């Protein structure tokens, strides 16, 4: 009754990073479904908060084992479960800021529980901008390419991301990520697409600043 | 009978160019199915040629009329016809190579045949690259995001592209586009994707650089 | 008494442009010091005008060959004279806005004036954006990087621009240019620095839209 | 007689990184000439060794206070001292890499040594690239722009670098820093220019890889 996962698990976070000089640090738990491609997180700022720019900045940051994968198209992330895998990615926005997220997937054996380790970085947020002046609500579903990198064992993945405005008009993000199994695959997915609905709500109190997300998530091929 | 369109038409184009200091001028001609998204065109170098660079950077350069619309969803393109439309986009090439298209599409009324009228131009292809070295074979398929743009009655085009290498391997530009009616419309469709197939085909001969080109697309929306 | 070149010549100027889908022809005149790297041109918009744009984004596209070269630095400008050369240039803005353009220098024989062919195409300047909505006054002076392509007998620059704001304040746009003499060079400079100083004045009278550029450059070494 | 600091000091230097996941700690110390605008720094690879990309990349990584200001032109780092400050820095690869460094400098007090801590992450550097191969020699001598932020009381650093090829020709990396001093100053600078020149030289032994930079810097205004 497993590849590693069962159809309802339970993730952990734990998250340390620096934006625009700022420290912190990040705890999460969840429940998900890997195979529907479907989960619900809950995050709270154990050192650092409240945090002065937005939540949003980090949500890609907090699994592609959370997607819906047909049969025809191989699953690169599950396939690599238990064992996990880590991954890279540069943030890009339109403003000049940069950040980059590297993460540590590892499923728990008997806990049926899936760990996460990242660290997120970034800087060069303009103090006028729409993520210092926390101007931002929620990410508009994408699309994103995922293309297998030949003799490498990895996978490649991209998507322009636009961040929704609290006052209207979109926010671009360009994200470049690599997928790294920890062990080369016998088999390696042709390129498809990931098409993505990240949601966020913020939960906090005048003593602690938490907040939910949500992701469903569904690969596909070329439509052509 | 017609949007201004019909289930079969013809088109031609006419392009001037310059790639890195290389002027050109081309003519083309085809028959489309807008209401199917598909299109098959031949093109023909009447100035310039043979061209020193890749047939493949003007591919794209060579009508979001071509595009199977849902019920659902708003057709910016056709509800432009035949007064047709305006187009601009900014070719962003891994390599620092910069290339920059605008476009007329105006439908002949009597004729059943829609014009083209283009403008490339480009600079800053490595000597030794895909494009100066015509080492590619082929886009691609791909996603676009269309987005409205609120106040302003155009629409706005992203897609990260692939073009192909003979060598094996993947060369990318990045594609970002102004669509422009002619006229406010009244309707505007909601954000949504275009999936594209763009195939091209040599048939040059040593008395005549030509070639066809072939497109097939269809816009849907967000599968969340 | 020349290198094609006098102490003081003439230079006469003639752009073809489309910016966001806007077209316009342009005119100018000048005098200049080849040796000194200084240089006065007047423009004059005699196709449309009034132009919707800045006329700040065109300044750079109004001849290396305007700059004062220490003798320890060779001068691929002046050595490609009176024969001249092109240079083309991708204008990278902060905004999404892409530009290029592409220019031929010739240097009138018994004239002693230079001529320069131009062809400006630029798009996706936001309406809401400092060049659509004129709200710049300059560009702040600079440092190129000048740097000889091997095997290639051609020159790149480099440069990060500034533009000012009206309201106070910096507008970004990345200089990427390729020098190419019209003829293989029996010599080339070891890479370099060009400093400039770029003004512009509007000179418009209700009657036509003109106005007037000045620079004034210098060539030097690393001072390390 | 100090500024916080002498003509001759000492540096320590402590890094953490990840790089294409691949995480390191390193240590340094040097000796430095902060108003000749010259250092000299001996790293060593306490955790990660041998590393698995050039060292060339963490270079820039391994403190303006060692820059030679001219009178006339306000020293924001000398000033700065001996509270210190903190730089955040993007680096953006031509072919894809991004970096992330981020600092803290802090003058000893009674030791007349100057510490730094920072944090150095970085993916995306193809592995058949001159980093990861380690095809790199030295950077190219710059000139980089320094600007002030206005209602901020932080500098802008903007420079275009060449890393060169073992094999000849040159590696592109965009730097993009922001300079925070500790505390607000009563003085700001005005944009100026800042002439570099860093050297690497590589001191490993089949027992520690080891490593000496060397660096030289000039501020500089306008030559207009």
């Given at each position: 009754?497993?590849h ?12 340390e ?9 990040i ?6 479904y ?6 619900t997180?809950?995050?709270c700022?154990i050192?650092?908060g409240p945090l ?8 890609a ?12 198209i191989?699953?690169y ?11 890279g990615?540069?943030?890009?926005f ?18 049926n ?13 303009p ?6 002046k ?8 994408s699309?994103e ?11 490649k993945?991209?998507?322009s ?7 209207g ?10 997928y790294?199994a920890?062990?080369?695959?016998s088999?390696?997915?042709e390129?498809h697409?990931?098409?993505?609905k990240?949601?966020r ?16 998530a569904?690969?596909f091929?070329?439509?052509?």
């Amino acid at each position: 009754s497993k590849h590693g996962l069962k159809e309802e698990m339970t993730m952990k976070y734990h998250m340390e990073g620096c934006v625009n000089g700022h420290k912190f640090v990040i705890t999460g738990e969840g429940i998900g479904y890997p195979f529907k491609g479907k989960q619900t997180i809950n995050l709270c700022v154990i050192e650092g908060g409240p945090l002065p720019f937005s939540e949003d900045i980090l949500s890609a940051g907090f699994d592609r084992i959370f997607t819906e994968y047909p049969q025809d198209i191989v699953d690169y992330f599950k396939n690599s479960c238990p064992a996990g895998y880590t991954w890279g990615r540069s943030f890009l926005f339109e403003d000049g800021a940069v950040c980059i997220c590297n993460v540590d997937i590892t499923v728990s054996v008997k806990e049926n529980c899936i760990y996460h380790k990242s660290i997120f970085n970034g800087m060069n947020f303009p103090a006028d901008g729409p993520v210092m002046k926390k101007m931002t609500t929620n990410w508009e579903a994408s699309c994103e390419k995922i293309m297998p990198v030949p003799k490498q064992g990895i996978l490649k993945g991209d998507v322009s991301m636009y961040l929704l405005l609290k006052d209207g008009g979109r926010y671009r993000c360009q994200f470049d990520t690599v997928y790294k199994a920890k062990s080369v695959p016998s088999k390696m997915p042709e390129w498809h697409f990931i098409q993505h609905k990240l949601l966020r709500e913020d939960r906090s109190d005048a003593k602690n600043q938490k907040w939910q997300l949500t992701e469903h998530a569904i690969a596909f091929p070329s439509a052509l």
